[PDB]
Amino acid sequence: CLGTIGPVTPLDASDFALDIRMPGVTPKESDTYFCMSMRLPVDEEAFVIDFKPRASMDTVHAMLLFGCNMPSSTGSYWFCDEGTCTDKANILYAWARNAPPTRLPKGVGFRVGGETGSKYFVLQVHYGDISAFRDNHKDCSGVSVHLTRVPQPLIAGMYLMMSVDTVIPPGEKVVNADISCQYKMYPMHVFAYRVHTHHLGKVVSGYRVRNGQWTLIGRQNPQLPQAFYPVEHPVDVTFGDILAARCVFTGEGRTEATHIGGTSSDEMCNLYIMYYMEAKYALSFMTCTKNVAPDMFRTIPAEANIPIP
Ligand SMILES: [Cu+2]
């Protein structure tokens, strides 16, 4: 936080590192999410290929890195409750304390810059428990990013699944939020995933369904750290398969109905599926906001319901 490392350190011929650090912030209460931005130094296309977390051990619980064109603020920093990005927050990295970080496979890179690519990174740093004192304590937590202009042969992106149609009535023991779209692109290979809900979430499970056979992509309690969990053996998703996902909620202790689709006195059901695709057929993001094949869930594997506390 009195370091001298610089915002751009050119590496070999065609690479560079970007040090994305909080500008000396001071978290005052616990559970605080501060956000900041770095613009890419290049207008042309570029490939994020590695990450080094540089977090203050003492207090930082989680870190997220996003790629987007419109950060919710132009200030040196802001509370992330304001928003992350005004446009798509294309999530690229998540670090949790104790979580394994998930390393990109050799030759996989996120595509940024140029025409489609995100022009800004937005870093989100989550501070759990501050101590009482620490007079004026400045913190410069963040991440360094390895960019290269050398074209990568595998491109990574995010397939996002979200539920927006389903209500949790109060006191209802167990409620299933279900999500499914047909896949219609060139092949993706899912190598990681992260889940997200708020406090009524019990388990999130993601599948590839091919000719009525379910293959597990990943499965997790969303009350654990929302880092990216690795997929033991990467699952290939190809044309005509179906992605299906099930969030299990409860409505216990809840007074009125709770809606799964935004705000804060709301719930959410998101599965972030991180993939790669051969560069020439690739795209950086895909979304599913529907349940096209709802009856299919009568055959969901039993593992999808058994909780993982
Ligand atoms: Cu949320």
Fold: same for 1-156 and 157-307: yes
Query: Does residue 46 contact residue 92 with C-beta atoms inside 8 Å?
Result: no
* Nearest partner of 124 among 159, 89, 155, 176, judged by Cα: 89
d(CA 250, CA 49): 39
**Burial class of residue 40, CB neighbours in 10 A (0-12, 13-18, 19+):** buried
Ligand 1 geometric centre to CA of 65 (Å): 16
Largest interatomic CA distance in the chain: 62
The CATH label, of 3.30.450.20, 2.60.120.310, 1.10.10.10, 3.40.50.2300, for the domain at 1-156 is: 2.60.120.310
Ligand 1 geometric centre to CA of 254 (Å): 18
Ligand 1 geometric centre to CA of 128 (Å): 17
Between the alpha carbon of residue 245 and those of residues 34, 57, 155, 195, 292, the distances in Å are: 30, 34, 24, 10, 12
Structure tokens at 192: 């990681």
Method by which the model was determined:
X-ray
Query: Does residue 176 contact residue 255 with C-beta atoms inside 8 Å?
Result: no
Q: Which CATH architecture has domain 157-307?
A: Sandwich (2.60)
Residue spans of the domains in the chain: they are 1-156, 157-307
**Phi, psi torsion values for 297, nearest 5 degrees:** -70, -10
Query: Does residue 17 contact residue 11 with C-beta atoms inside 8 Å?
Result: yes
Where residue 262 falls (left for φ over 0; alpha for ψ -120 to 50; beta otherwise) is: left
Ligand 1 geometric centre to CA of 77 (Å): 20
Ligand 1 geometric centre to CA of 64 (Å): 13
Q: Count the Cβ atoms, other than its own, within 10 Å of residue 192.
A: 22
Ligand 1 geometric centre to CA of 91 (Å): 13
Ligand 1 geometric centre to CA of 213 (Å): 31
Query: Does residue 268 contact residue 262 with C-beta atoms inside 8 Å?
Result: yes
SS3 303: helix
Ligand 1 geometric centre to CA of 263 (Å): 8
Query: Does residue 218 contact residue 211 with C-beta atoms inside 8 Å?
Result: no
Ligand 1 geometric centre to CA of 268 (Å): 6
Ligand 1 geometric centre to CA of 14 (Å): 38
SS3 81: helix
DSSP tag of 34: E
